[PDB]
Enzyme design. Structure first.
Site, mmCIF file in Angstrom:
data_model
loop_
_atom_site.group_PDB
_atom_site.id
_atom_site.type_symbol
_atom_site.label_atom_id
_atom_site.label_comp_id
_atom_site.label_asym_id
_atom_site.label_seq_id
_atom_site.Cartn_x
_atom_site.Cartn_y
_atom_site.Cartn_z
ATOM 1 N N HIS A 81 -1.913 9.384 -33.001
ATOM 2 C CA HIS A 81 -2.832 9.819 -31.960
ATOM 3 C C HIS A 81 -2.225 9.401 -30.638
ATOM 4 O O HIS A 81 -2.392 8.248 -30.246
ATOM 5 C CB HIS A 81 -4.246 9.237 -32.138
ATOM 6 C CG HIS A 81 -5.198 9.749 -31.093
ATOM 7 N ND1 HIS A 81 -6.411 10.343 -31.418
ATOM 8 C CD2 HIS A 81 -5.079 9.761 -29.733
ATOM 9 C CE1 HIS A 81 -6.997 10.699 -30.253
ATOM 10 N NE2 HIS A 81 -6.195 10.372 -29.229
ATOM 11 N N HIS B 189 -0.410 11.150 -26.600
ATOM 12 C CA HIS B 189 -0.422 12.284 -25.685
ATOM 13 C C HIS B 189 0.767 12.158 -24.749
ATOM 14 O O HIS B 189 1.111 11.027 -24.349
ATOM 15 C CB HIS B 189 -1.616 12.191 -24.719
ATOM 16 C CG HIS B 189 -2.949 12.195 -25.412
ATOM 17 N ND1 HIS B 189 -3.560 13.389 -25.770
ATOM 18 C CD2 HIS B 189 -3.743 11.166 -25.784
ATOM 19 C CE1 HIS B 189 -4.704 13.092 -26.361
ATOM 20 N NE2 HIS B 189 -4.841 11.753 -26.387
ATOM 21 N N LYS C 131 -7.583 19.021 -33.525
ATOM 22 C CA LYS C 131 -8.311 17.969 -32.824
ATOM 23 C C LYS C 131 -9.673 18.425 -32.401
ATOM 24 O O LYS C 131 -9.820 19.505 -31.846
ATOM 25 C CB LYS C 131 -7.524 17.520 -31.583
ATOM 26 C CG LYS C 131 -8.261 16.594 -30.622
ATOM 27 C CD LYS C 131 -8.476 15.193 -31.204
ATOM 28 C CE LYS C 131 -9.095 14.244 -30.194
ATOM 29 N NZ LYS C 131 -8.141 13.981 -29.133
ATOM 30 N N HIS D 174 -11.995 12.559 -31.990
ATOM 31 C CA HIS D 174 -12.331 11.661 -30.903
ATOM 32 C C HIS D 174 -13.808 11.309 -31.218
ATOM 33 O O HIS D 174 -14.628 12.179 -31.541
ATOM 34 C CB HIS D 174 -12.235 12.349 -29.490
ATOM 35 C CG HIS D 174 -12.817 11.485 -28.377
ATOM 36 N ND1 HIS D 174 -12.008 10.907 -27.393
ATOM 37 C CD2 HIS D 174 -14.120 11.124 -28.123
ATOM 38 C CE1 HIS D 174 -12.814 10.208 -26.594
ATOM 39 N NE2 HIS D 174 -14.090 10.308 -27.005
ATOM 40 N N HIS E 110 -10.509 6.762 -32.756
ATOM 41 C CA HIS E 110 -11.031 5.761 -31.818
ATOM 42 C C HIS E 110 -11.942 4.791 -32.565
ATOM 43 O O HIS E 110 -12.829 4.173 -31.996
ATOM 44 C CB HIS E 110 -11.814 6.380 -30.629
ATOM 45 C CG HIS E 110 -10.943 7.338 -29.861
ATOM 46 N ND1 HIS E 110 -9.549 7.217 -29.849
ATOM 47 C CD2 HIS E 110 -11.290 8.408 -29.093
ATOM 48 C CE1 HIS E 110 -9.088 8.232 -29.087
ATOM 49 N NE2 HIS E 110 -10.102 8.967 -28.604
ATOM 50 N N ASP F 227 -12.800 1.100 -31.617
ATOM 51 C CA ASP F 227 -13.672 0.895 -30.472
ATOM 52 C C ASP F 227 -14.966 0.211 -30.895
ATOM 53 O O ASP F 227 -15.782 -0.197 -30.067
ATOM 54 C CB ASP F 227 -14.033 2.222 -29.790
ATOM 55 C CG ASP F 227 -12.964 2.819 -28.889
ATOM 56 O OD1 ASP F 227 -13.170 3.872 -28.354
ATOM 57 O OD2 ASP F 227 -11.874 2.126 -28.663
ATOM 58 N N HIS G 270 -6.795 2.724 -30.680
ATOM 59 C CA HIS G 270 -7.019 2.214 -29.315
ATOM 60 C C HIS G 270 -6.568 0.760 -29.196
ATOM 61 O O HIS G 270 -6.990 0.037 -28.290
ATOM 62 C CB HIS G 270 -8.503 2.319 -28.936
ATOM 63 C CG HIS G 270 -8.769 3.613 -28.222
ATOM 64 N ND1 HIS G 270 -10.036 3.964 -27.797
ATOM 65 C CD2 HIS G 270 -7.918 4.622 -27.841
ATOM 66 C CE1 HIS G 270 -9.937 5.146 -27.195
ATOM 67 N NE2 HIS G 270 -8.689 5.565 -27.199
ATOM 68 N N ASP H 6 -2.943 5.864 -28.487
ATOM 69 C CA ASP H 6 -3.648 6.776 -27.632
ATOM 70 C C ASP H 6 -3.057 6.615 -26.234
ATOM 71 O O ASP H 6 -3.788 6.504 -25.251
ATOM 72 C CB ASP H 6 -5.183 6.630 -27.620
ATOM 73 C CG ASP H 6 -5.947 7.734 -26.893
ATOM 74 O OD1 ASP H 6 -7.058 7.578 -26.478
ATOM 75 O OD2 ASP H 6 -5.338 8.898 -26.811
#
Ligand SMILES: OCCc1ccccc1
Ligand SMILES: OCCc1ccccc1
Ligand code: NA
Ligand code: NA
Ligand SMILES: [Zn+2]
Ligand SMILES: [Zn+2]
Ligand SMILES: [Zn+2]
Ligand SMILES: [Zn+2]
Lengths: 331, 331
Positions: free
Chosen positions: B21, B23, B135, B167, B196, B199, B220, B267
């Site tokens: 994950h 970008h 996604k 997400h 995520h 989190d 994350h 991420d």
């Protein structure tokens, strides 16, 4: 002395008969490129646009102002391609409509100003095609973000001389709040066109804005769902008022003495993805003339109602030229 | 037997150590092409990405999964360019995040399905680069449109065998609603990564999803505003939990017997326009290692906590390989 078009600068006299609020395609940023099949194909859309533009040209249209912003999915390369193929001048826009993505919505007035300036002064994307108008919008009271957009539009206009044109909820009298924000930035009303103004019958509203120096955009003339009262999405978008009712607003304004502040258009398009599927077909059945509706139907209608030749010519040629000519505020 | 990357298909063995994950740039559709100066310049961004990818590669990363969708402003050409220059495999995504424009938001499940299929089977835009993952996203209870996206994602996955990754607002247990919707479409939990997930400190929620066969994306890890409490925007985005607390969730899941269902990532990104200006710099100061954070700090940390070599290799190599390998449901 020059107006920027997708084919480069043109002289004021070359603009001729101009449609001030139109679109080649009503979409979303990146949409046409990621899903061209939504419109059949990019080629099909281009061909459709060329046919429409050629027919409008046959009817006398020399230039159209494509008020598609970044968020309307404006594809300047497509604009340049159809402009060249149909031999119709097309003025591109910068600004933001009411569908900005987060990357835009989180920006400050300063950053947005830089973005608008980029598109007007340097060029859109990496094409060198410079915008000749700034498009903004509200749909009732402006949102916090929209106030920033209007302010940046004002700043960009003041720095470049390029005019500003808007989308409004005419019913809600958006134009008044827009004028207020613009004037708070020192923008002259003469550099602004309050769009979709024919969406309301409140002549008091129109006239008061006209009285202040604003240009009134009567650009939804052919928009009507009459005969389709059974199609909810279409009625919602198009309204139940006739084209004649809307067209009559032009004469009213003329009668009130504001012929020099009127701008007329169709707000037409060849592709439309930002609404229900099929709205394009629905619209094309409602108004087969498309962009040619103004010269083919509206102009003759007004003449039949007594509007003189020179006033008609003034509205379709003179007014657009004065609006589009980049004009800096006197120091 | 093959995974689609921005440079073409690779065999399952070629994936190697994979970050699931990530970008290259977190933006909006059409944003990078319309306002590259936001990132200094397109070249500057590319150069930054190449440096980061080269450092991650030095640390053992062989592939990254760029989970940027159309609405995250994914620019497949950029991905291909950087993948080639840094020599790191990059898997592209289709699907929709939480900022779809009107042209996407008004679409039906059937329409969205065709769009996702296009990106997976034929290619993104006109590039032929095919997506290797789908996604999706929610931020609390799904909106009506998000439910459609989830259903379309499931249908596209069922037809192609490509996995779905999400997400979530982890602390709100979105994974549960996501799972319910996916299941309602008959998708196997093994084709889904609930992202995520680190989190939240609710291990019960995570283990119950794992128990059902879902993959848990603990992506994350390096995200923390500890030391920046005074920065509201950064605090809101990154939280106040430490990287060690998040990394310990990997150990917790292992201890509960779910080592085969864990996916680890950072991420990270090289540009980020979809939030406050300057968030990228803030983030880079928080985690200078960027994408290399996982191999340089997390892996060693876990080893130090007793996680065996084989387990670490299985999570970073085996799990991603199994998840990314296109797998159709048995008949
Ligand atoms: O000068 C009067 C001619 C004219 C009429 C209508 C609009 C612009 C100009
Ligand atoms: O066969 C057991 C090796 C393995 C460990 C952790 C995750 C995937 C596989
Ligand atoms: Na200019
Ligand atoms: Na494929
Ligand atoms: Zn409009
Ligand atoms: Zn319009
Ligand atoms: Zn996310
Ligand atoms: Zn992400």
């Amino acid at each position: 002395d020059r107006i920027n078009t997708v084919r480069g600068p043109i002289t004021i006299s070359e603009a001729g008969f101009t449609l001030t609020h139109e679109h080649i395609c009503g979409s979303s940023a990146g949409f046409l490129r990621a899903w061209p099949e939504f419109f059949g194909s990019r080629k099909a859309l281009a061909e459709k646009a060329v046919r429409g533009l050629r027919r409008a040209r046959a009817a006398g249209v020399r230039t159209i102002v494509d008020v598609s912003t970044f968020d309307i999915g404006r594809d300047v390369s497509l604009l340049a391609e159809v402009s060249r193929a149909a031999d119709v001048h097309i003025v591109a826009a910068t600004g933001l409509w009411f569908d900005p993505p987060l990357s835009m919505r989180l920006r400050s007035v300063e950053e947005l100003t830089q973005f608008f300036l980029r598109e007007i002064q340097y060029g859109i994307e990496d094409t060198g095609i410079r915008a000749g108008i700034i498009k903004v919008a509200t749909t009732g009271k402006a949102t916090p973000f929209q106030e920033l957009v209007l302010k940046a539009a004002a700043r960009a206009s003041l720095a470049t001389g390029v005019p500003v044109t808007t989308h409004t909820a005419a019913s809600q009298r958006d134009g008044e709040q827009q004028a207020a924000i613009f004037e708070s930035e020192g923008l002259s009303p003469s550099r602004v066109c309050i769009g979709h103004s024919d969406d309301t019958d409140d002549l008091s509203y129109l006239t008061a804005l006209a009285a202040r120096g604003y240009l009134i955009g009567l650009d939804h003339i052919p928009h009507s769902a009459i005969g389709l009262e059974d199609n909810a999405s279409a009625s919602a978008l198009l309204g139940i008022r006739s084209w004649q009712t809307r067209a009559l607003l032009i004469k009213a304004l003329i009668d009130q003495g504001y012929m020099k502040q009127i701008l007329v258009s169709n707000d037409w398009l060849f592709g439309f993805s930002s609404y229900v599927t099929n709205i394009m077909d629905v619209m094309d059945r409602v108004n087969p003339d498309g962009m040619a509706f103004i010269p083919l139907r509206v102009i003759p209608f007004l003449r039949e109602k007594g509007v003189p030749q020179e006033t008609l010519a003034g509205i379709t040629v003179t007014n657009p030229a004065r609006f589009l000519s980049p004009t800096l505020r006197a120091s």
